[model samples]
Target chain A: ENLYFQGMTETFAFQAEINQLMSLIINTFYSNKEIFLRELISNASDACDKIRYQSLTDPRLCIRVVPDKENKTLTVEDNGIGMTKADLVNNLGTIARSGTKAFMEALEAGGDMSMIGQFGVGFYSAYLVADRVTVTSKNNSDESYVWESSAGGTFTITSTPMKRGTRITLHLKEDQMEYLEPRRLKELIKKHSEFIGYDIELMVE
Target chain B: ENLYFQGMTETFAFQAEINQLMSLIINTFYSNKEIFLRELISNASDACDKIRYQSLTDPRLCIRVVPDKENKTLTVEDNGIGMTKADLVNNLGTIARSGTKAFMEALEAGGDMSMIGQFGVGFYSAYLVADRVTVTSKNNSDESYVWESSAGGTFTITSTPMKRGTRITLHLKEDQMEYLEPRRLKELIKKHSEFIGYDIELMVE
Candidate 1:
């Protein structure tokens, strides 16, 4: 991947059914490209929420982090439930546990999927707008790492002195430049996923 | 479902899958909910287009529609494509076509989805804001007619002869009354559906 590895490398195989489902999701489920930004920000919010819930149990660690709208950056720092190197590969590299099947089935069954969203493919949506997506993550148990990918499905993971949680930088695409606009991103956050995340701030660049 | 009828009988079986998709869209996709007024008005534009297109093929009929903005009503009175009673029952009563997935797929395949949008559930989105909706339509093939539906979807289609196409009057809800304001409605029309139909005119109160 041209992103994290500093150069191009061979594309690895995504797990069995995961490849099929991911193709379906990338090609079918996400209709609007702008939604990619929403999904990434949502994942960021989920990370923030994880830390917030953890801080209730372990008050010694700093848990509160907000989006830096002025810098056009969103940071979700968490001291709890951090992922390791293996976690990064298993969680993000492949489709993980086939969240897409359950997601599609639930929607098909009319099962009130209002609060539920796919965990894996949603993160990939960031590439719909950002040609380069940078994910620097640090876990309490493992060394910090950085994962990077473009929209082409190929990604790379490398060692980095990352923060305790995940910080995703979505380099906004030209058409998707709206996401970099603080007002629009804030409006979208307030409009769609308000109840889903914690302390989301849009950088006004 | 409360929307459609069974084979040959007035007893309805279920709403069309596409129609259900439309209802879901109204409940989910549209932001601020007031956009439904614009959707319904856009439908009226399509109905008007049918008449105008017919006039090009057959000069025997002339298309004329006066958009009434004062009472928050835009009527598309025309001599154009008219639906039979059965057509009305089949198209309006139930979901006649496949579902939205097909149209979304078509759009994904580089086909325009907006053409299909002017029909199907997109029209009913008007009910998102309007408390009551009145449609006065004339059919060259059948008797001229009027169809009325309240916000909740209960509708009655009756016969009345004048011309052909469809004339619809949308009663705007108080908060959604901006649609009835000629300036705002026209502005939105210009912005969103600039290339929608031919020679569209706004009738201001």
Candidate 2:
């Protein structure tokens, strides 16, 4: 497993889906924290699928999970088509607010629902159980970079060294320590993501 | 029992909530046509409450029901705050579009939902059972007007003489002739509106 990312960090304020949308995502949408892992894995699966589509090669595609007890963090890493800095800033910086607006309009007009193709808010749900989240991603055409946030108003991006994929590290909240357990994760995977199209390998001590 | 509306009829196109929103209200939202009478009565009850508030006297506030079996129409009339020509063009002409938009935003932002004070779309549910609707309203401050629509692209308004309040008549659909039965209306009233704060007297003769 690749680890360690150190460089000059660049900070950026949240572009959209501020307090109100976050409150909806965290408190109401799913309402249960147990579903958070499934959401994360779904993203991971999507990323892997996109990357495989790009390569079209029968690579041993896998989703890797690392529960770091010493650091008090949970990581879900996927070998997928990783996002560049522009992609990261655009994709992660602004999410759900506009798509949500369009979605509401569609429902209001009783209109079409095809506008939600690029709508990705699952990454933000990490905030439900985590005080902080760190994303280390590397695209084949671009250099590796690290995006880290404390689930606050601002997030920072820094340079990193990694392969052509993404690694998401969730700095779990104190009360949400149950997610750091392998048994809980395994149970949740069995119940929610057993049909997921990749081998999600959890690290052993 | 006052009957007759004769004047210069003026035509106007629908303002909003055109097809999509109507589809939602009619086909998806409640879906069941049985609730149409209940919704109409709710509006009638609301109007009566508003009128009673203005008067502040114990005048027998009641909502009257007239099932014209001959014309195959169901009418719910209330002596409440009747709407003017402008109100007819504004309120009845444009019912659920903006209100539904704000409602979606409220649910999206998970924001405060106090914006729905004047948001009245209960009148539109008449379209669920009726192919056409005729609303005759008389406001104390304004002349009575007859607003009629076939739940299509446009509606017409004509000046009429009536007592204060509003009366909504539904030209029942061919398959929805059941609503024209006083027994069915009574059963629906007993089931859905027994606690409604008005003496909803159904006309016998």
Candidate 3:
């Protein structure tokens, strides 16, 4: 196992070649950015599942999507086992370099392939359209923290206020505002995560 | 990034809880064992795609499935960018622990979910019915190597003689002999990978 070499506040460089992989993921999924919601919802369901199992009762696990048109941001929130500092560091900070390298190599090799990422890295799919992402999460084990990154090789984490669960706010790019539309969001959710076992709500205010 | 701490001969333990994860993958995909074929074929296609990208002209990239019914083994062989010893150690040995742990935690948390492994552990799906797996690979940049392991946590690697690319041998479990049939294999290919972007041949000797 790869050991954590540093304490809190240490920034990590991505494992694989970041610029190439990011470009591939963004370009490859640009035509199908709708799946971003699917991936996010899938993760939320997993978080909810974690809490439900711990409690053994039907825990109040909810996933809410709030699209702020004025701010040009879209937030997907879930009341699940949020990430501790370590969880964020290990998961979001360092993705499996081998998989990223392999996928990029394959794409660069020009295989006429249509789909990839079956082996994870679905989180990077968020960058298909978003210029910046902010993750606010709270786990029972550690203090709630905010992870902010702008597709660069480095990410910064700071302690934040949150009761429980994870909330991801995506700063949508200018050309990607369609994702904020209620009709488009509904269609994407129904197409990708209608069967996901969770309470998914689209909230407006 | 997690650096490769050990050299070629070092045996590494799998990062996450393997037995439970294997059981989850097997049970979750019980009804769709044929997906094992799809996943394997998909990987083979990616390998071929990689080689094609390297040699803009045509490189001889072939994926052959040889079923040894008498020996209760199935071999998925590909002539693509074979893995180096380090690649095997990192990719096969240390999967993204966070993803695997999260998936297992979710399952153990009892979400009644039936799917996971979006971040790249799809290779281990071979254990769905196989008790043991052996990988022999030769890469241009690295020497040939053999990686062998059961579903146990540890894996051992040694030098081996191999041609270019990768060959994975699966020791089929008892009662799973139906996969050895040529007709069944063909149907699986047509159903799952008919659109795969390469030449996939089933070999009999």
Candidate 4:
């Protein structure tokens, strides 16, 4: 496991030349932007599922999305088991999201591109629509922390305090501004989350 | 690996009392008999898939279902990776189809029955339609073998010779005659095997 410094900002480079991986996702999926928000929603639902399994009740589990048109950013927040700094680095920073070796090995062997969604790299689909992505998560095991990246090469993680959960803010690209609409967000949720167990609320600006 | 006596028919008791397990499958799924043939076809397809992976060619891979109405037996055969004597016992005789311990452990912990088709025990759906089932297989690893059982407390395996692949013939019950019809088999195949990579053929008479 990689080490993390608490109460201070730290930055680390990804294990591989991430530009190739970033280009793989952004180029292949830019035509299908609907997959970006759905992937985030799925990530939120997964976090809630983890906490739900731990508690086995309290349907209070929910997701909230706040789209700021002025800032040109979209935030997806979930009241679930947030991540410690190690999780942030290992899951997002390194290619180890699913299995770093397996991901590269499979892709190298001419694996199916459709497998991108199934492979844990689904979260990185954010790069298709957002120029920058920021994550702040608080887990019971550790203090709140932040992880943000432009997919240029390295990402920064800083100490941040928040209620127990995860909030991901996507600094949207100029061309992807239509995603900020509540109508599009609700339509994406309905199409992608027909089986989601928790309530997902979209906040109006 | 358990020692399999070669050159003669050998009968052994199942690792556990099999009646309870058989009853569990038969009672719960008899009303949903459509699952029986589909499971057999899936098993055949899986065997073919293994060989396909080995060769990486030859769209010659196929499944043939022979439904004998006069004798009330339905045979599904495929030129796939057939089971060796050890595989026959390990996969079919003991509850070790998936993971013997895992199967019992999961079911003991109240797993979903929908997991039946996913778990390796989907082969046992034969009991939903047949009073007895027989498997003949030849593999690269070992000589051909015959495994037969009535879901009784014990099963018998005998050394047998055959071409490469597996053949399963279900001794259909009186009420399962509908499955002998080509129309029904085609329908079941359509519903369950929409994504099958190879051709499936149904033989007349």
Question: What is chain B's TM-score across the candidates, in the order shown?
Answer: 0.64, 0.80, 0.82, 0.84
DockQ of 3: 0.01
Cα interface RMSD of each candidate:
26.6, 31.4, 12.5, 28.3
| Alpha-carbon runs more than 4 Å astray in model 4 | A1-7, A17-19, A27-29, A56-59, A95-114, B1-205
True lDDT of residue B55, candidate 1: 68
The docking quality of candidate 2, as DockQ, is: 0.00
Better of 2 and 4 by lDDT: 4
| Local distance difference test values of all predictions, in order | 0.53, 0.70, 0.73, 0.76
Q: Give the per-residue lDDT digits (tens) of candidate 2, residues A1-205.
A: 2111113345566654443445444444333666567777888898898988877673687888788889999999998888898777666764335665544445357542222234445566677788788888988889988887775566666765377789999988788898888898778778856579899888866
Model 1 lDDT on a 0 to 1 scale: 0.53
Give the alpha carbon lDDT tens digit for every residue of A13-38 in model 4.
66563546776655564346667777
Give the clashing residue pairs of candidate 3, or none. Answer: A53-B109, A109-B53, A119-B118, A119-B119, A119-B120, A120-B118, A120-B119, A120-B120
Measured against the native two-chain assembly using Cα atoms, what DockQ does each of the candidate structures obtain, in the order listed? 0.01, 0.00, 0.01, 0.00
> CA lDDT of A14 in candidate 1?
53
Q: Identify the leading candidate in terms of lDDT.
A: 4
| lDDT by residue for model 3 (B1-205), tens | 2341112234566655654676666455455555566667777778777777888864467788889988899889899888887788777766465656676676577632324536355677788768888998898889898888786667767664267888889898786788899998887767756587677888856
TM per candidate: 0.38, 0.43, 0.45, 0.45
Candidate 1 lDDT over B36-136, as tens digits, reads: 54455565566656767766788433333344555655444434465666566556645446535565455457644244564355665555666666666
What is the DockQ (computed on Cα atoms) for candidate 1? 0.01
Model 4 per-residue lDDT tens digits across residues B1-205: 1111113455655655354566676566434666777778888888988997888673488999899988889999999999997787666665334344455467779775445666677777788888889999999889998888887666777775277998998998777789889888878878867877778888987
